[PDB]
């Protein structure tokens, strides 16, 4: 059964709910992005309005084969009326697609759905700035003051000028990056960039893409794994069984490794900067861990809700245990507190 944070009162609308079978009184189904844990439950056999992001839509059809009649996708930053109600989409600064939901309820309460987000100053001069948000449901994913990473420019410079001088150092050294979702694209299109190279990937990765609106992608990535020195696997190849066993694969046409792990935090990010991260190695193949989010940082986060001033938040991420959802709501009170609302 759907549960209490997935509902929208005063509507017939959920959010992020497709696991639960038909829900009671639901009319229409949104899906803030395209992660399996948000849209677990969808296949062709769905025949309820999804609303969603044109990119959202795109993955819906050709990954999932959800029918196009059932398919309801909305422009950005533009009021838009759904089963007599007026909402609007913006973004959220996650992986492509991904959204934030503004609905505009008939009694005069007006809710703000953050989706999956990493909170920016940017949004403080979207469609938000001009009005009051009553009730908050919030990525609290981060929700703790020892979850700090750097910007993700600074991640980018440091993954740019670490493969830049590695294959400088020796031109047949192959760098390769993780993935296992949508996301982080600019990690492996950087490099590549900085490189001279298209990406190499798997025929499933490519059509992946190929969903994602991205500006000149066919002239950045191929399925010609011989004509590209940047490639991208699987994160569960990336350790030195499956890195070994990748070069094998590429006929004598490298002798060094160097691979990327994006992850999010980690708790190395408590005494480690950016700039002095070092990899693990073996022989000739090293492994870099990298600390490139797509979730707000606490600071981010505390930032964002304290110039929104919301009169109620519920969270959406970390709610299972009494002592995290005890926590956040501490949290919540001194940020209400110091900012006065
Ligand atoms: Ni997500």
């Given at each position: 059964t759907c549960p209490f944070y997935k509902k929208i009162p005063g509507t017939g609308f959920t959010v992020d709910a497709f696991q639960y079978g038909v829900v009671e009184g639901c009319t229409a189904y949104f899906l803030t992005h395209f992660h399996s844990d948000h849209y677990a439950g969808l296949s062709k056999h769905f025949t309820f309005p999804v609303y969603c992001s044109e990119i959202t839509g795109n993955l819906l059809k050709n990954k999932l084969h959800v029918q196009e009649q059932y398919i309801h996708p909305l422009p950005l930053d533009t009021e838009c009326i759904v089963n007599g109600v007026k909402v609007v989409l913006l973004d959220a600064n996650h992986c492509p697609g991904?959204?934030?939901i503004?609905?505009?309820?008939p009694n005069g309460t007006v809710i703000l759905h953050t989706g999956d987000f990493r909170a920016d100053p940017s949004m403080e001069?979207?469609?938000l700035a001009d009005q009051?948000?009553?009730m908050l449901y919030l990525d609290?994913?981060?929700?703790?003051?020892?979850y700090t990473f750097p910007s993700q420019q600074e991640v980018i410079r440091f993954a740019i000028n670490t493969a830049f001088e590695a294959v400088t150092l020796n031109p047949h050294a192959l760098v390769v990056c993780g993935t296992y979702s949508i996301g982080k694209e600019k990690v492996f299109l950087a490099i590549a960039d900085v490189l001279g190279s298209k990406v190499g990937m798997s025929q499933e990765k490519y059509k992946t893409l190929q969903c994602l609106n991205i500006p000149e992608i066919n002239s950045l990535i191929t399925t010609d794994m011989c004509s590209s020195l940047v490639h991208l696997l699987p994160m569960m190849q990336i350790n030195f069984k499956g890195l070994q066993s990748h070069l094998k694969k590429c006929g004598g046409k490298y002798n060094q490794i160097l691979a990327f792990r994006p992850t999010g935090w980690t708790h190395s990010n408590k005494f480690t900067r950016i700039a002095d991260v070092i990899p693990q190695t073996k022989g000739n193949i090293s492994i870099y861990g990298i600390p490139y989010s797509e979730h707000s940082s606490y600071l981010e986060m505390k930032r964002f809700v304290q110039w929104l001033k919301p009169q109620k938040?519920?969270?959406?991420?970390?709610?299972?245990?009494?002592?995290?959802?005890?926590?956040?709501?501490?949290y919540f009170r001194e940020?209400?507190?110091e900012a006065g609302y």
């Open positions: 991904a959204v934030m503004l609905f505009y309820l001069r979207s469609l009051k948000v009553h609290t994913t981060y929700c703790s003051p020892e938040i519920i969270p959406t991420v970390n709610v299972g245990t009494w002592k995290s959802r005890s926590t956040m709501e501490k940020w209400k507190l």
